[PDB]
Enzyme design. Structure first.
Site, short mmCIF file in Angstrom:
data_model
loop_
_atom_site.label_atom_id
_atom_site.label_comp_id
_atom_site.label_asym_id
_atom_site.label_seq_id
_atom_site.Cartn_x
_atom_site.Cartn_y
_atom_site.Cartn_z
N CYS B 103 13.51 10.29 -80.16
CA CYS B 103 14.36 10.90 -81.18
C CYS B 103 13.73 12.20 -81.67
O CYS B 103 12.62 12.19 -82.22
CB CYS B 103 14.58 9.97 -82.38
SG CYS B 103 15.61 10.75 -83.69
N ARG B 106 13.32 13.16 -86.04
CA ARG B 106 12.50 12.35 -86.95
C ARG B 106 11.92 13.12 -88.14
O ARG B 106 11.27 12.48 -88.99
CB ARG B 106 11.36 11.69 -86.18
CG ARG B 106 11.79 10.55 -85.25
CD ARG B 106 10.59 10.06 -84.46
NE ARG B 106 10.35 10.81 -83.22
CZ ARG B 106 9.25 10.67 -82.49
NH1 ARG B 106 8.31 9.86 -82.92
NH2 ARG B 106 9.08 11.36 -81.35
N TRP B 275 23.33 12.78 -87.77
CA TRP B 275 24.27 13.81 -87.34
C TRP B 275 23.84 14.35 -85.98
O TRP B 275 22.73 14.11 -85.51
CB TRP B 275 24.37 14.95 -88.34
CG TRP B 275 23.06 15.56 -88.66
CD1 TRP B 275 22.38 16.51 -87.96
CD2 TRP B 275 22.25 15.25 -89.80
NE1 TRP B 275 21.21 16.82 -88.60
CE2 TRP B 275 21.10 16.05 -89.73
CE3 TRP B 275 22.40 14.37 -90.87
CZ2 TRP B 275 20.10 15.99 -90.68
CZ3 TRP B 275 21.41 14.31 -91.82
CH2 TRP B 275 20.27 15.12 -91.72
N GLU B 280 23.81 17.76 -77.53
CA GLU B 280 24.27 16.42 -77.18
C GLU B 280 25.75 16.43 -76.84
O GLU B 280 26.18 15.77 -75.88
CB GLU B 280 24.04 15.43 -78.33
CG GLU B 280 22.61 15.13 -78.68
CD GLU B 280 22.49 14.13 -79.84
OE1 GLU B 280 22.60 12.91 -79.59
OE2 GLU B 280 22.29 14.57 -80.99
C1 HEM Z 1 19.75 12.53 -88.61
C2 HEM Z 1 19.64 13.34 -87.56
C3 HEM Z 1 19.31 12.86 -86.12
C4 HEM Z 1 19.26 13.67 -85.07
C5 HEM Z 1 19.52 15.20 -85.12
C6 HEM Z 1 18.94 12.88 -83.89
C7 HEM Z 1 18.79 13.32 -82.59
C8 HEM Z 1 18.52 12.50 -81.51
C9 HEM Z 1 18.67 12.84 -80.12
C10 HEM Z 1 19.17 14.19 -79.59
C11 HEM Z 1 18.30 11.78 -79.39
C12 HEM Z 1 18.32 11.72 -77.86
C13 HEM Z 1 19.63 11.02 -77.48
C14 HEM Z 1 19.81 11.01 -75.98
O1 HEM Z 1 20.38 12.00 -75.43
O2 HEM Z 1 19.39 10.00 -75.34
C15 HEM Z 1 17.89 10.71 -80.28
C16 HEM Z 1 17.43 9.45 -79.93
C17 HEM Z 1 17.20 8.38 -80.78
N1 HEM Z 1 17.30 8.39 -82.16
FE1 HEM Z 1 17.74 10.04 -83.25
N2 HEM Z 1 18.80 11.57 -84.30
C18 HEM Z 1 19.02 11.51 -85.66
C19 HEM Z 1 18.99 10.36 -86.44
C20 HEM Z 1 18.52 9.11 -86.10
C21 HEM Z 1 18.53 7.94 -86.96
C22 HEM Z 1 19.12 7.97 -88.39
C23 HEM Z 1 17.99 6.92 -86.29
C24 HEM Z 1 17.74 5.46 -86.75
C25 HEM Z 1 17.59 5.10 -88.03
C26 HEM Z 1 17.60 7.41 -84.98
C27 HEM Z 1 17.00 6.71 -83.96
C28 HEM Z 1 17.01 7.12 -82.64
C29 HEM Z 1 16.72 6.29 -81.50
C30 HEM Z 1 16.35 4.79 -81.57
C31 HEM Z 1 16.83 7.02 -80.39
C32 HEM Z 1 16.60 6.51 -78.95
C33 HEM Z 1 17.95 6.36 -78.27
C34 HEM Z 1 17.87 6.74 -76.81
O3 HEM Z 1 16.93 6.26 -76.12
O4 HEM Z 1 18.75 7.50 -76.35
N3 HEM Z 1 17.94 8.75 -84.90
N4 HEM Z 1 18.04 11.20 -81.56
C1 LIG Z 2 21.64 8.24 -84.57
C2 LIG Z 2 21.75 9.29 -83.49
C3 LIG Z 2 21.84 10.63 -83.83
C4 LIG Z 2 21.96 11.60 -82.84
N1 LIG Z 2 22.05 12.92 -83.16
N2 LIG Z 2 21.97 11.21 -81.55
C5 LIG Z 2 21.89 9.91 -81.19
C6 LIG Z 2 21.92 9.57 -79.72
O1 LIG Z 2 21.61 8.20 -79.49
C7 LIG Z 2 21.81 7.64 -78.25
C8 LIG Z 2 22.44 8.31 -77.21
C9 LIG Z 2 22.62 7.69 -75.97
C10 LIG Z 2 23.30 8.44 -74.85
C11 LIG Z 2 22.26 9.20 -74.03
N3 LIG Z 2 22.90 10.29 -73.29
C12 LIG Z 2 23.90 9.73 -72.37
C13 LIG Z 2 23.57 11.19 -74.23
C14 LIG Z 2 22.16 6.38 -75.79
C15 LIG Z 2 21.52 5.71 -76.83
F1 LIG Z 2 21.08 4.45 -76.68
C16 LIG Z 2 21.36 6.35 -78.05
F2 LIG Z 2 20.76 5.73 -79.07
C17 LIG Z 2 21.78 8.92 -82.15
CL LIG Z 3 26.54 10.97 -77.97
#
Ligand code: HEM
Ligand SMILES: Cc1cc(N)nc(COc2cc(CCN(C)C)cc(F)c2F)c1
Ligand SMILES: [Cl-]
Ligand code: HEM
Ligand SMILES: Cc1cc(N)nc(COc2cc(CCN(C)C)cc(F)c2F)c1
Ligand SMILES: C[C@H](O)[C@H](O)[C@H]1CNc2nc(N)[nH]c(=O)c2N1
Ligand SMILES: C[C@H](O)[C@H](O)[C@H]1CNc2nc(N)[nH]c(=O)c2N1
Ligand SMILES: [Ca+2]
Ligand SMILES: [Ca+2]
Ligand SMILES: [Cl-]
Ligand SMILES: [Gd]
Ligand SMILES: [Gd]
Ligand SMILES: [Zn+2]
Lengths: 402, 399
Positions: B103, B106, B275, B280
């Site tokens: 993520c 963070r 958000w 993305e």
């Molecule tokens: C608030 C602004 C946030 C932004 C801008 C953001 C952005 C991102 C992005 C770009 C990813 C990669 C997604 C992908 O393409 O796989 C990600 C992954 C992740 N985020 Fe965040 N996120 C946000 C909030 C959160 C929140 C609120 C949580 C949980 C309380 C969280 C937990 C996670 C987790 C567990 C992943 C791993 C999911 C995966 O493996 O794709 N995020 N985040």
């Molecule tokens: C809370 C939050 C905020 C944010 N800005 N973006 C995310 C993206 O979370 C995930 C995205 C994918 C698709 C991975 N790819 C195909 C795009 C698989 C997952 F398991 C995720 F948790 C989550």
């Molecule tokens: Cl998405």
């Protein structure tokens, strides 16, 4: 089982069985992955040698033949007497190709079988070393129709120093540590520049001054040799539709020739063995000209393009960087110098992975280095899971000699 | 202790926190697999989380500390599981975000709204908690981070599972020519909705119903009221034909199929939302070859030369799609962030965490944005990836 690998663009799933043959260990443990880090005895030499020989004989479809038995017994005898052995000419050519084939961070390995191998193992001085290098430069440049080449200087042996090329590449531009802490030139070359000056070179004041070569022959300080200008093909940069771009005064050189890595074959080590191919345009366009710690021209291009550089959300940086890449590609194609863009390059690497799965059952690839520095998910390697591991023969990094 | 370099700057730090890695990842000395997407002893895990919690509030080994220890001991002796206090639940939820290596957002981890839904039974209550979440988090376009925790897993009982991978998903309809209309990623859930009795739309942007599952029951279809699902029609600041392509996306990224783990407790349903980072939407969802795959359509519209790769028509089109995504969210006053601002904020998070915990688990491949890689500072930052707990985790499908 072996690691199951998946392509997320197509759905297809492979298993990397080649990775089990990995000998030398990398930097990861099950507690923590260090994949993003840039830099991580008679009886061991024998087992490496045996492995290499078996490899050569497999390649020529002759495993277990009389000649295979005999060459293994030959190598065993020479090691027992001298502590080392010598590669046959055919084994050296095969070994150089295998080292390229095995390099996990190289995206251009679709070519690994078309490599010209120059045998310089009888070299005995810095002067003869320079002549071998000029012959390589000439052969590989070929007036802009680039040909892949490698020249192999003599192997490390006990009781005598190594041949080294001090320069990290045969063609590098000077980096003059300016006084206000800044740099005029390529910042990546400030150290090798100060070393050239200290070794007698009279420096210039341009931003694209070609450095001379520092060649180290065994047990002797390095010697300075100036490349003849007609030998260094260079491309001035212009944009197909941004005519002011030419006024920026930008150039790059034709020939990417890495001179500071160690080649390792069947346990033997060659400290000097420069190799060259042709450029992928994103190495010049994105990394060399836009990295903040290199020529760092991204803002000046964007401003000239009249982009709103006061907010990131206009994506001025992405717009300027695309256009710097267009200019590089257009400029190399105009001057009839080989070049490949990161779309063709990565699509041919997808072709290489599939050949390798068939041929060997796997392919060592470092995902972070194979994905290009712009437009990553637009190329198909982005969606390809990769397995990273070390096979031999190999090109390896080595300490700076000074 | 791994040396970690930043190459644009030259700074060195040391990751001492990787030593605390509780679980094991997929890599070994023989082979790195970091590119892969999916790689009563409960007492030990529960004890550790407690020591963590009380250290974090500067009350270690104190009276309240030892009181909670013997409390959980007897709770699992009597029941076989134990109950989290609300504060520890809040703390575990934030920690598990703070520990998420993939993520990039963070920098925000301390500010998260935790809705406690552990008192839930039946899917209709599920559905009510969920619509309150969407309402709270959307907030008329000014987005706010939030998670809703549903009842933990316990022996002999079913789990609560949200079947949809997200709370907002567009339909994917398989066609007789094989291809998909709508989101190809969602073909599997779209037939599940139609099977359990949903009337299929036929647009490229039909919002799916929710398939919610209360323990030891089949799942129930629930339709989200359209006024609750806020959507952004995509237009371009200067290319006036872009609007007519009919592209849209939604406002709230709300992941609903990951499992949350706290002190050895397991919450199979704990949807969280934040958000969006612009790339993305603009790059992965609209431009991946196996998603909407709109890149060539947009290039054609820009009159680019699409028959040779070296014109970089893919790159020029991708940028303008990201430009339209950014312009459209801001115009409609929906929270969004560009990849430059996001990666610079992650750099600040790294520094802050270097000081607070001595390190920060980070997965380079997922931190670096999928366009303009080396144009952002995280490209040049070496990173260490490991698994702390509390954590979020993938989990098998409910079927
Ligand atoms: C608030 C602004 C946030 C932004 C801008 C953001 C952005 C991102 C992005 C770009 C990813 C990669 C997604 C992908 O393409 O796989 C990600 C992954 C992740 N985020 Fe965040 N996120 C946000 C909030 C959160 C929140 C609120 C949580 C949980 C309380 C969280 C937990 C996670 C987790 C567990 C992943 C791993 C999911 C995966 O493996 O794709 N995020 N985040
Ligand atoms: C809370 C939050 C905020 C944010 N800005 N973006 C995310 C993206 O979370 C995930 C995205 C994918 C698709 C991975 N790819 C195909 C795009 C698989 C997952 F398991 C995720 F948790 C989550
Ligand atoms: Cl998405
Ligand atoms: C012929 C066309 C070639 C192309 C297009 C190409 C492309 C590339 C690129 C883009 C990289 C990553 C460079 C970086 O960012 O550091 C690379 C790395 C590498 N290449 Fe190739 N190359 C070619 C030929 C060769 C040849 C002929 C050899 C050796 C015989 C070779 C061996 C290597 C090695 C060892 C690396 C890893 C070094 C590193 O970590 O950067 N390449 N190549
Ligand atoms: C033969 C060949 C062909 C080709 N097209 N490109 C290359 C690039 O090889 C290297 C480039 C760098 C520069 C470091 N980079 C961050 C800019 C360092 C190395 F160690 C390399 F091996 C080699
Ligand atoms: C920190 C990071 O691992 C480092 O900057 C790497 C990432 N990927 C790369 N990939 C290529 N091709 N070349 C590079 O120099 C790098 N740098
Ligand atoms: C094969 C590779 O691991 C896979 O495509 C990863 C790489 N990086 C990613 N980065 C983000 N943000 N999202 C992703 O889905 C992925 N996918
Ligand atoms: Ca001999
Ligand atoms: Ca048919
Ligand atoms: Cl280079
Ligand atoms: Gd013009
Ligand atoms: Gd037109
Ligand atoms: Zn690893």
């Amino acid at each position: 089982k072996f690691p199951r690998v998946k392509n997320w663009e197509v759905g297809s799933i492979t298993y990397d069985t080649l990775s089990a043959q990995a000998q030398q260990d990398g930097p990861c443990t099950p507690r923590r992955c260090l994949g993003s880090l840039v830099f991580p005895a008679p009886e061991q030499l024998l087992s490496q040698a045996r492995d290499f020989i078996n490899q050569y004989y497999s390649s020529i479809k002759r495993s277990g033949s009389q000649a295979h038995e005999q060459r293994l017994q030959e190598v065993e005898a020479e090691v027992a007497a001298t502590g080392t052995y010598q590669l046959r000419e055919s084994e050296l050519v095969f070994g150089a190709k295998q080292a390229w084939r095995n390099a996990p961070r190289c995206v251009g390995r679709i070519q690994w079988g078309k490599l010209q191998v120059f045998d310089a193992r009888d070299c005995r001085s810095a002067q003869e070393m320079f002549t071998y290098i000029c012959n390589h430069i000439k052969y590989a440049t070929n007036r802009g129709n680039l040909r892949s080449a490698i020249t192999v200087f003599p192997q490390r042996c006990p009781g005598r120093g190594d041949f080294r090329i001090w320069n990290s590449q045969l063609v590098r531009y000077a980096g003059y540590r300016q006084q206000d802490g800044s740099v005029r030139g390529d910042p990546a070359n400030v150290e090798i520049t100060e070393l050239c000056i200290q070794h007698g070179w009279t420096p210039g004041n341009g931003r694209f001054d070609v450095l001379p070569l520092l060649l180290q022959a065994p047990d002797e300080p390095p010697e300075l040799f100036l490349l003849p200008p007609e030998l260094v093909l260079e491309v001035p940069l212009e944009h197909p539709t941004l005519e002011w771009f030419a006024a920026l005064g930008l150039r790059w050189y034709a020939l990417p020739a890495v001179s500071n890595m160690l080649l390792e074959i069947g346990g033997l080590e060659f400290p000097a063995a420069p190799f060259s191919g042709w450029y992928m345009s994103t190495e010049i366009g994105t990394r060399n000209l836009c990295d903040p710690h290199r020529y760092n021209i991204l803002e000046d291009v964007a401003v000239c393009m009249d982009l709103d550089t006061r907010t990131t959300s206009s994506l001025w940086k992405d717009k300027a960087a695309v256009e710097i890449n267009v200019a590089v590609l257009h400029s190399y194609q105009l001057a009839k110098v080989t070049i490949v863009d990161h779309h063709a390059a990565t699509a041919s690497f997808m072709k290489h992975l599939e050949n390798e799965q068939k041929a060997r059952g796997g392919c060592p690839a470092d995902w972070a280095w194979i994905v290009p520095p712009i437009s990553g998910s637009l190329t198909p390697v982005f969606h390809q899971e990769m397995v990273n591991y070390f096979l031999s023969p190999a090109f390896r990094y080595q300490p700076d000699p000074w």
